[PDB]
Symmetry: C3
Subunit: 461 residues, 3 copies
Amino acid sequence: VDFERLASIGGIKGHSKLYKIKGHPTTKDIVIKLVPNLNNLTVCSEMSIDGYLNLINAVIIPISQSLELMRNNVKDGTPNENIFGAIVAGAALGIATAAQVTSVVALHKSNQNAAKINSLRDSITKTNQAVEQLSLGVQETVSVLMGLQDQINTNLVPKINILSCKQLSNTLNIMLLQYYSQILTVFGPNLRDPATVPVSIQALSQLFEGNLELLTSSLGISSTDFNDLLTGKLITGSIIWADTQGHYLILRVNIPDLIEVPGAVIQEFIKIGYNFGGSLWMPTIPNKIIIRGYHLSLIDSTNCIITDNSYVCDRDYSLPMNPILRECFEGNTSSCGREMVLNSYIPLYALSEGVIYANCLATSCKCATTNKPIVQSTSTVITMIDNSKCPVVEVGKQMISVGSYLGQVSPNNLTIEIGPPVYTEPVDITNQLGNINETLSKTLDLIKQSNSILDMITGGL
Amino acid sequence: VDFERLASIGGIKGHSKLYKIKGHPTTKDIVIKLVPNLNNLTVCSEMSIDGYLNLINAVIIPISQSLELMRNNVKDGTPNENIFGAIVAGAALGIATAAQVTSVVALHKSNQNAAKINSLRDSITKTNQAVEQLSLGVQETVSVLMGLQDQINTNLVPKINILSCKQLSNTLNIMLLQYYSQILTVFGPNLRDPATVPVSIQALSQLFEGNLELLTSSLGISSTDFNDLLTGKLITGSIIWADTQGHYLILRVNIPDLIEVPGAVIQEFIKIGYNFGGSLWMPTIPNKIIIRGYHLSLIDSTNCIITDNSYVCDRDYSLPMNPILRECFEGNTSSCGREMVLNSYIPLYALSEGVIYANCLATSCKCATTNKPIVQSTSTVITMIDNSKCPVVEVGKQMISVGSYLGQVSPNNLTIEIGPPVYTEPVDITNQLGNINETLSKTLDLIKQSNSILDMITGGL
Amino acid sequence: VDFERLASIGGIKGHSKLYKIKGHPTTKDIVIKLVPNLNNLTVCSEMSIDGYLNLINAVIIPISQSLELMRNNVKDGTPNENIFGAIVAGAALGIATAAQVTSVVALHKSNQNAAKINSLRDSITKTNQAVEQLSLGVQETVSVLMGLQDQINTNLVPKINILSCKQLSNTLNIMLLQYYSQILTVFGPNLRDPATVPVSIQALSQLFEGNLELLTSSLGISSTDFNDLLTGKLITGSIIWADTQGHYLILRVNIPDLIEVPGAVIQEFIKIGYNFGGSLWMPTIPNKIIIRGYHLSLIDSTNCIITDNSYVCDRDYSLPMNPILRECFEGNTSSCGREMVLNSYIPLYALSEGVIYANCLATSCKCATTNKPIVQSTSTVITMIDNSKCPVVEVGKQMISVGSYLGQVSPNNLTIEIGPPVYTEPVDITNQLGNINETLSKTLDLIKQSNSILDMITGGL
Ligand SMILES: *[C@@H]1O[C@H](CO[C@@H]2O[C@@H](C)[C@@H](O)[C@@H](O)[C@@H]2O)[C@@H](O[C@@H]2O[C@H](CO)[C@@H](O[C@@H]3O[C@H](CO)[C@@H](O)[C@H](O)[C@@H]3O)[C@H](O)[C@H]2NC(C)=O)[C@H](O)[C@H]1NC(C)=O
Ligand SMILES: *[C@@H]1O[C@H](CO[C@@H]2O[C@@H](C)[C@@H](O)[C@@H](O)[C@@H]2O)[C@@H](O[C@@H]2O[C@H](CO)[C@@H](O[C@@H]3O[C@H](CO)[C@@H](O)[C@H](O)[C@@H]3O)[C@H](O)[C@H]2NC(C)=O)[C@H](O)[C@H]1NC(C)=O
Ligand SMILES: *[C@@H]1O[C@H](CO[C@@H]2O[C@@H](C)[C@@H](O)[C@@H](O)[C@@H]2O)[C@@H](O[C@@H]2O[C@H](CO)[C@@H](O[C@@H]3O[C@H](CO)[C@@H](O)[C@H](O)[C@@H]3O)[C@H](O)[C@H]2NC(C)=O)[C@H](O)[C@H]1NC(C)=O
Ligand SMILES: *[C@@H]1O[C@H](CO)[C@@H](O[C@@H]2O[C@H](CO)[C@@H](O[C@@H]3O[C@H](CO)[C@@H](O)[C@H](O)[C@@H]3O)[C@H](O)[C@H]2NC(C)=O)[C@H](O)[C@H]1NC(C)=O
Ligand SMILES: *[C@@H]1O[C@H](CO)[C@@H](O[C@@H]2O[C@H](CO)[C@@H](O[C@@H]3O[C@H](CO)[C@@H](O)[C@H](O)[C@@H]3O)[C@H](O)[C@H]2NC(C)=O)[C@H](O)[C@H]1NC(C)=O
Ligand SMILES: *[C@@H]1O[C@H](CO)[C@@H](O[C@@H]2O[C@H](CO)[C@@H](O[C@@H]3O[C@H](CO)[C@@H](O)[C@H](O)[C@@H]3O)[C@H](O)[C@H]2NC(C)=O)[C@H](O)[C@H]1NC(C)=O
Ligand SMILES: *[C@@H]1O[C@H](CO)[C@@H](O)[C@H](O)[C@H]1NC(C)=O
Ligand SMILES: *[C@@H]1O[C@H](CO)[C@@H](O)[C@H](O)[C@H]1NC(C)=O
Ligand SMILES: *[C@@H]1O[C@H](CO)[C@@H](O)[C@H](O)[C@H]1NC(C)=O
Ligand SMILES: *[C@@H]1O[C@H](CO)[C@@H](O)[C@H](O)[C@H]1NC(C)=O
Ligand SMILES: *[C@@H]1O[C@H](CO)[C@@H](O)[C@H](O)[C@H]1NC(C)=O
Ligand SMILES: *[C@@H]1O[C@H](CO)[C@@H](O)[C@H](O)[C@H]1NC(C)=O
Ligand SMILES: *[C@@H]1O[C@H](CO)[C@@H](O)[C@H](O)[C@H]1NC(C)=O
Ligand SMILES: *[C@@H]1O[C@H](CO)[C@@H](O)[C@H](O)[C@H]1NC(C)=O
Ligand SMILES: *[C@@H]1O[C@H](CO)[C@@H](O)[C@H](O)[C@H]1NC(C)=O
């Protein structure tokens, strides 16, 4: 890539950032109960829980039936001389993708630990705090957690005899209907097929009044650096069990780990407007360029958070990049497109390494040390300003100071090649088909005329 | 549609789902009061409700003025000695669309029932619970409801003498300002024209701390099947009265009914990547195809929820399609495009009716029963695997079982007709059309060369 | 612009609205403390504030480091006869844009007032209410504000001895972790570079359970009309100080003011479907047209709120338009494109100035006073109906009265030039591009043949 030609065409090299991808995940199991455990309210609660049970039995049971029907269709057992491999039976899957088969194998792998967690059903249903721990084994533990258990241990419990019992029943019914509406939002796409559709940690934290840090601290991941603070909206978990007796869900989440792809640099660009032809134009180049061993591609930051030093993505998002745009980035300024603007929010100057790239035709350029104006050179459009011209520079309304030097060759003195204008809207490209087509039928008419005139020239002699 | 040629090019038939549209609605009236009724706080509340009244009088009154002005135009009694009905006076409406005139007719139809509800203004303003009923007639009733009437009957009421009166006044002012900010979000677009703009039930349920099931249960709709549980984010409603004395809004909502369009099947397609020309490509086909009497069209699922067995749309979204795409779907795989990728998240195998469609050039394919590798045939690109090859198949890492057979036609032996390499669907191709225009401009130069050929043609003398 | 021809092609003139821009901002200063002040809880709270302090020290300190670096970059000085200020070092700033330099100038301008506010740190840390005032000067005041200061002055405080102290500690820890999760959402992008990134007032009001009116009333903006009532999501603001001892942020916000751009009219358009060629078509025109002294442009209403009478934008959004679209709007109906639909939600009639523009080919048109059908004229496509034809018009199932007069010439007696069908598909444009491929390879072959003829027969004999 040549930055001098691309600076003369109107693109200024910005920051250089690294590239990191989530990869190599380990698994940790949590359990979520859905019916709140009340024991202080054994005096005045009536049978208000029965409506909530009839509301959630239409959600829990169709999850569990599809889960166990997905569980039957994988069977282990040795295929002859080969050792193992947990055969997924394709007779009873109908139509399935690769990720669905991977999820089926994940359930068949997690069956034993699901049974180990399910062996403590009486231990799970007896909790009476928000988040606590239970001893799973000699060194393993579960992290059972319920959002509403605090609210019927510090708000509704002290009004056990001050307030009337029917008011407690009505308030409990209102809060349970609101919470049932909260389950019916996060577990919405899961009801289609609750083995392949995962659960984001932000939507899962929406059950606890938007408390992501409680889930993160109870899970075990503890961020200590600046890059892992904004990261935390991408922990992904899936359902492995949907037990109906205690009305609870056993969930398995993946602890992320940020690996770095070797030798990849993300390059940002600043686009300014230049005055040509009596109009304001901008180059049509993408902002982000991924460079890895003199190989250029495109990425999209539609799901990736941008930190101060590196790009953190969920997964690789490398797209192929144009050979014409490859010539545009490398050497050919004529291959780079342009677009027309007239709006007022177009920047006209920028700073890079103590080097001012300024359009001095529209913005007044001066030097404070000598008090003389700076005029546009006719050979270039974007004006170099460095310390060789003047130290203190008036640009816009601003005193600025400069430094360093040009760098290899100056982009002010060489020739320029302005590319063609590029438009967008489909009526314009239908008219582009038009002025393709009249020119096309001129070329065909010239083919016919020229080929007749060949034989009156070559044939006649 | 022929699935065999489209599987040979790289598109696999997915599930088949039905199509159902909301339609034929009945109407039901609710009322929402805005001033919370306090009678327990007659000792220590001061006149803090007056600021809330002055805040909401700038909202209720300009709604009510336009609401009575839009019903002041339509008049009944068709001049026709025989024909009779409602007439909309177009000279006073100015500029209007069809739905605005339909809403004006709806208000003129609902004026009598709005007056019947307005006849119990003293009954509406005397409520002191969250949701209750009032006797509208001998068999009809209203469902008056207040969001904050629970919170100043179970939280602020018991601290009537423990806490200081100015602290209750400050807390009531903070709660009323927050609630006034909650009215100023949901009734935002309604302030422009409060007769033609409907209200979604999610935005209306945002007033009640996100409790949609409370409004669904108090309205009368009780879903009992799996399809209607996820439905309930599309119940619309419009304002019919904006009474300023009791500061309440009489609202009319439509109970939805899911009707089924006869003989329409929604079909999905799974796209896999095939290795051709030393590169990874996928065919460019839409995922969703509606089929109705051998007629193919296009739908967009941007506002339609997807259930497990059918598509539920708020309204018909049938878009036309190109005849080239019709030939691509029917017989002509040369009319189907292809696009180029190099990313890692491209699936290379899938399962359909026990038949494995796998690209064995990129993924290692083996058989467990015989332990021999499977090689790509040169006459095809996508490899078909059934029980005739081998029962247990090694794909990737997974053991899988297969079943059934080809059905009618086999993609394993058919000829290949991979079409043109179509370029980028977004605007970048126009930039290519830009240099195609530059190609045109060099053919114009060729025309200019034939402006110089026609010169030396005149040197034929 | 001629509305008769544009009504003949299928576009109906809608409402006329004004255009207003937010501009000329003055500055106000607020301070946001982060640690809630507790003094009633000196008996039973333990040291649970220490974990919250260790959580927020990772947020506060890098902001302060980046801010003091940005103050170090600017340097107050005067090279000769200068404006006695500014001066930013190019070497110390690296790579930057214009807005970042403007933000550096803003911090250097607001340093003195930041020190004046910072002189009352002991006054800032001693507050015990939600929002109160402190005397900054003889006529200036600050508006120190805390969101959770109400909730540990009316809810956790009265249960000081009824509830156990460990339950108070657990509830305080849960509330503080939830609030730390609330800081880690609004100041998310601000951690990257905390001097050039603004804070929206809606995201800032999300800390106080979505109470925008509390911030607006405590800030000083008191909107009293209908236009500025919905405005209030565009207040914005930036950070100027990040003090670590009291753990507070000093923020500077802009009080808005709406100015009017002179002589600009925003025009909407209603698009109806017309039946031509046995198909249903709509013209391809933009909805919004800005007209300013015969100068047409395009605007995008993606960030602008639409009131009843005028458009309010955060900033000017004038985009250029194609001259063929200018010919479409002025005189040429053949320059206006069209698109094909078959869906049912296409409006077929409208009303403008008491004049009915209706498509009577698809929808039945009758006159109620005379009881005769209305037939489509072959010369026109869209039927004009006024009081000269019949007063009461059956359209659809509706009575419509008409009036006023026609307006210059009718859109029914003029000729209609239907433009080209704008309908673009990637495979079709790739196929005609392959026609261009074979076309230039024909023209280059014939030009090589004609150049050989230019060589050895122009010098022949
Ligand atoms: C999930 O799997 C269990 C276990 O069945 C095993 O896996 C299946 C995929 C097949 O390969 C089976 O051959 C295999 O054993 C299924 O439970 C079984 O259900 C059937 C009915 O579908 C039961 O048969 C009944 O049993 C008693 C006999 O007294 C009577 O009530 C009836 O006459 C009837 O025969 C069967 O006992 C039961 N268990 C076993 C071990 O086979 C289960 O159906 C399956 N799928 C789902 C969707 O739940
Ligand atoms: C809504 O419609 C009502 C009904 O009147 C109808 O519309 C009018 C514009 C006329 O065309 C009528 O023929 C037609 O029935 C309007 O109510 C009218 O309001 C005006 C004031 O706006 C009243 O005039 C005043 O009323 C009292 C009468 O004691 C005195 O102060 C004055 O002497 C003065 O007349 C008028 O009485 C009243 N009723 C009628 C029958 O005209 C109303 O204006 C209209 N529009 C709106 C925006 O509400
Ligand atoms: C921000 O600015 C402060 C203030 O310093 C002033 O501005 C700088 C840009 C320079 O032009 C300074 O000359 C100018 O006074 C900087 O604080 C200064 O930091 C240095 C270290 O970088 C301190 O030096 C210390 O000196 C003694 C030596 O015995 C020891 O305590 C230490 O080992 C250390 O070397 C210096 O005292 C300090 N203060 C002043 C008034 O100069 C600061 O570094 C700068 N930048 C940042 C990123 O914070
Ligand atoms: C509401 O439910 C709670 C659940 O915690 C009951 O809490 C009770 O709290 C008391 C102290 O306030 C506990 O008594 C003491 O506990 C420890 C452990 O043995 C020890 O210091 C003493 O020996 C003494 O027993 C008590 O254990 C605990 N009870 C239970 C069942 O958890 C509270 O009583 C309930 N309220 C009502 C009205 O029942
Ligand atoms: C808050 O306001 C409400 C409503 O005005 C008041 O509710 C009242 O509650 C009392 C409870 O003692 C009810 O008393 C009734 O007494 C007899 C007992 O023989 C019997 O008829 C009932 O079972 C009932 O207990 C009273 O009817 C009820 N009032 C109404 C209008 O429903 C309440 O007093 C107020 N609270 C305060 C603190 O002022
Ligand atoms: C919890 O903190 C609050 C903070 O406000 C303490 O409030 C105290 O309120 C009482 C009245 O309830 C005040 O006493 C009286 O105030 C007025 C003067 O304004 C006057 O009537 C009397 O001369 C008398 O002073 C009191 O000033 C105020 N502050 C303090 C420090 O007591 C409340 O006491 C705290 N509770 C506990 C248990 O610490
Ligand atoms: C593009 O640049 C190369 C050198 O990098 C040069 O050889 C070639 O002629 C250029 N092509 C143009 C300007 O079309
Ligand atoms: C640019 O070219 C001019 C001559 O045209 C020369 O004086 C100047 O030094 C050049 N700048 C460089 C090589 O940086
Ligand atoms: C296409 O090329 C011609 C000839 O150089 C030029 O006049 C025209 O502006 C070009 N069009 C575009 C859209 O670049
Ligand atoms: C030129 O126009 C004709 C219709 O007159 C059309 O059939 C043909 O495809 C066009 N050729 C192009 C756009 O290259
Ligand atoms: C499309 O396929 C049919 C047979 O399925 C064939 O007759 C026809 O010629 C094909 N059309 C093309 C290749 O354009
Ligand atoms: C496909 O061709 C194979 C030979 O490669 C043959 O065995 C098989 O019967 C063919 N299937 C058809 C024509 O359906
Ligand atoms: C556009 O309209 C003008 C008159 O306003 C006319 O002279 C011109 O020929 C038209 N151009 C077309 C229809 O292409
Ligand atoms: C349209 O022309 C007809 C005659 O063809 C005439 O009757 C009618 O008044 C005209 N409309 C105008 C000039 O608005
Ligand atoms: C069309 O483009 C291809 C590459 O896309 C090129 O090799 C060829 O020369 C062009 N012409 C023809 C006739 O294929």
